[PDB]
Subunit: 89 residues, 2 copies
């Protein structure tokens, strides 16, 4: 009568076998989710790169534009001086 | 008189200023275009961030689930270990 212990062992052993099985399902499900995340992450790095390229292009072009505004400001100065002198006549 | 040299310096300056205006027009077009390219890539990334977080949620949920199931399995293992001792004692 001390082998109800046997039945207890059987029950526990199947409970474990059932968990193991479920764990197998969650594992291959976890693999599929991690691959989808990994892919999106890579896509995100890529986008970061495109963004950087467009921003750096803008910064560069901005540099050009500030210089050109300096040059233009100077020509405007010389235009102002020459037209004052001209009017002096 | 001197006013011939002036009318000429004015012609030259008006010519240079004009040219720079052109250069500036070109630079500003490429600028507005680059900013727009940027805005588009930032919108595309935003959409991508949304998807990325959804996949992260799914992955987290699976992960939580797996630790859940491993815990349970460890609780059953605690039981099986006890019965195995009580059993081996006979």
């Amino acid at each position: 009568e001390a082998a109800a212990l046997r039945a207890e062992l059987r029950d526990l052993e199947l409970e474990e076998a059932r968990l193991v099985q479920e764990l197998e399902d969650v594992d291959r499900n976890l693999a599929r989710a991690a691959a989808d995340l990994q892919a999106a992450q890579a896509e995100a790095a890529e986008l970061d790169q495109q963004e950087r390229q467009h921003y750096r292009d803008y910064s560069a072009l901005k540099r050009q534009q500030l210089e050109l505004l300096d040059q233009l400001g100077n020509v405007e100065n010389q235009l102002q001086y020459a037209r004052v002198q001209r009017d002096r006549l």
